[PDB]
Amino acid sequence: SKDEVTAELMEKAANQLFTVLGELKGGAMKVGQALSVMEAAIPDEFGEPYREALTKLQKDAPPLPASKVHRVLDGQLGTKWRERFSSFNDTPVASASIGQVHKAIWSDGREVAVKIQYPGADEALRADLKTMQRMVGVLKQLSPGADVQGVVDELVERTEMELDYRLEAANQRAFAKAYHDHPRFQVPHVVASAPKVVIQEWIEGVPMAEIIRHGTTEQRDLIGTLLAELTFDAPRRLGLMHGDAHPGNFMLLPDGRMGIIDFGAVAPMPGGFPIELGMTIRLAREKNYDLLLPTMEKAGLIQRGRQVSVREIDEMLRQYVEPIQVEVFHYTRKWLQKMTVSQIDRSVAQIRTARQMDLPAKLAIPMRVIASVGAILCQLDAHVPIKALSEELIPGFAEPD
Numbered sequence: 001s002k003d004e005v006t007a008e009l010m011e012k013a014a015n016q017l018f019t020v021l022g023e024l025k026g027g028a029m030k031v032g033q034a035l036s037v038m039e040a041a042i043p044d045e046f047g048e049p050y051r052e053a054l055t056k057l058q059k060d061a062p063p064l065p066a067s068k069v070h071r072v073l074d075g076q077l078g079t080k081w082r083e084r085f086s087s088f089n090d091t092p093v094a095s096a097s098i099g100q101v102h103k104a105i106w107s108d109g110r111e112v113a114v115k116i117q118y119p120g121a122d123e124a125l126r127a128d129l130k131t132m133q134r135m136v137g138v139l140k141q142l143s144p145g146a147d148v149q150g151v152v153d154e155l156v157e158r159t160e161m162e163l164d165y166r167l168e169a170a171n172q173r174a175f176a177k178a179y180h181d182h183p184r185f186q187v188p189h190v191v192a193s194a195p196k197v198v199i200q201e202w203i204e205g206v207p208m209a210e211i212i213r214h215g216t217t218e219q220r221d222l223i224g225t226l227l228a229e230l231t232f233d234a235p236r237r238l239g240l241m242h243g244d245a246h247p248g249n250f251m252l253l254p255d256g257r258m259g260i261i262d263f264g265a266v267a268p269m270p271g272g273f274p275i276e277l278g279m280t281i282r283l284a285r286e287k288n289y290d291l292l293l294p295t296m297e298k299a300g301l302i303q304r305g306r307q308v309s310v311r312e313i314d315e316m317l318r319q320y321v322e323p324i325q326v327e328v329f330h331y332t333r334k335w336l337q338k339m340t341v342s343q344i345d346r347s348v349a350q351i352r353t354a355r356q357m358d359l360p361a362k363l364a365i366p367m368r369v370i371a372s373v374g375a376i377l378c379q380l381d382a383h384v385p386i387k388a389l390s391e392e393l394i395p396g397f398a399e400p401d
């Protein structure tokens with residue numbers, strides 16, 4: 001397809017760009033140069049074990065045949081795992097990132113989704129982690145000016161999150177408890193959890209992806225409004241944010257609730273949504289720069305001790321301010337495109353950004369989630385009463401009175 005191809009080209013462009021970002025901000029040299037160094041500095045004896053980890057994941061490429069599924073189940077729930085089910089469908093209904101999902105019926109009569117991890121995923125991903133740890137070591141020792149601070153920790157945590165299904169299961173349990181019998185959100189309960197098998201209540205509705213492509217106006221508006229609400233309700237309700245959003249994680253149920261099924265990227269927000277954010281947006285809407293700039297500097301939203309352009313502040317807060325200037329905002333791709341257009345052309349003025357490129361975690365985490373959610377709202381073409389949601393759920397945004 002022409003479009004199929006365009007999507008692939010965009011993906012490759014994005015990966016190229018992030019590779020360049022890694023070279024300029026991390027590795028302190030081009031990937032090819034670094035690779036030549038790495039191959040010289042890493043023993044060839046480590047090459048073939050590496051390969052012999054990636055072998056078996058290639059073996060038995062999707063979907064897994066029934067026997068191997070049953071083998072994984074043997075390993076995780078015991079050889080009499082069948083006794084825990086009323087029935088089990090050997091033909092997978094979906095794919096996961098390093099596994100596949102089966103529909104089944106639990107022993108108590110409930111329908112469940114069973115996510116089964118691919119047998120060779122563990123050793124492959126751990127060997128891959130080992131290789132990247134060695135490469136980080138090479139950069140740290142031999143690449144002058146390299147910044148690899150925190151990188152190994154991030155790789156370890158990502159790997160462990162992918163390989164141990166129990167972590168995601170714990171996150172999901174927190175949410176399932178919090179949103180039990182909620183009038184607008186449905187979180188399936190975790191039925192059982194193991195490192196390589198996780199079982200939860202079966203829910204199905206209209207996938208958000210489907211609503212993005214063919215949804216009615218009312219479907220779009222509804223699921224968009226629900227996502228916006230979840231985003232600000234969750235840290236308020238249980239001190240957690242669902243995390244970076246993706247349409248694959250959500251669905252619209254027949255009764256108008258939003259089903260939420262993926263909890264791998266849950267982010268900690270113990271104190272709830274920080275008040276400085278809602279406060280900043282309110283003060284920016286009123287263009288109260290006298291109070292806005294000190295508030296942002298205090299919060300760490302702008303760099304301290306710098307000459308700041310008010311025009312640039314307006315530009316950086318625009319995507320948050322414009323939606324709450326109306327009762328019901330229409331999130332559109334057209335509008336988002338406008339939000340990417342810079343107010344300050346660099347031939348007019350050469351300023352150094354006031355933006356904080358080292359955001360405090362307390363701010364960085366929810367802001368990243370909000371960005372993902374906002375982009376999804378624009379794909380949905382959703383009409384959302386974000387002003388009212390903000391007034392009720394976001395600390396500091398409502399008129400102080």
Ligand SMILES: Nc1ncnc2c1ncn2[C@@H]1O[C@H](COP(=O)(O)OP(=O)(O)NP(=O)(O)O)[C@@H](O)[C@H]1O
Nearest residue numbers: 094095096097101113188200201202203204261262
């Ligand atoms: N409770 C459920 N009911 C129905 N389908 C489910 C359920 N839980 C998961 N699925 C399906 O499982 C598949 C993978 O879901 P997901 O939770 O994203 O696993 P994952 O791939 O490990 N996470 P990710 O790496 O971000 O894609 C999707 O096609 C979902 O439709």
